[PDB]
Amino acid sequence: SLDHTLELKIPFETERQATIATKVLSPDPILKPQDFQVDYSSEKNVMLVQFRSIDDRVLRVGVSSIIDSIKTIVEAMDVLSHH
Template sequence: MNLFSFSNIEERSETNWFSELKIPFETAKQSKIAQNTLQPDPILRPADIDVKYSTEEEILVIKFDAVSDRVLRVAISSVLESLKTVIETIDEFEGKFDEYLQ
């Protein structure tokens, strides 16, 4: 079983801070949905941070490349907040397309 993990915040140079999140979902479809949902929105000022989303089967991988540790933390917490909504939506509605909701 995969667990949520993230690499320690790494200071590669004074203006390059890096971290990687790995979020396991139940299925590859779910991780793809999360990727497509999060991907379009720009985070903060694009010049300050680069966010790359990818999936490895059911795992969503998010790589952050930021100009400072502060920007990196703000970006990670913003993505996690959005991710909570994605997961709650999937939990509540997946597979209930053709039935009356209870």
């Protein structure tokens, strides 16, 4: 059962930003679907990412990698937002 759970709520400046980030995110984990699952979405300006996993080690590997993608986007919306 996938009972090791972690949600990550990330605030952008606005709903559009949030929305676009989730489109762009497109994850694709190395981890088995049986062992690890992720759900992304956005509500207003917040991005919701919900992880579900077998145990803490799986969780750790999967969550860091995602966070990495996210940052990449925040980095990219940073440079664009300012020109």
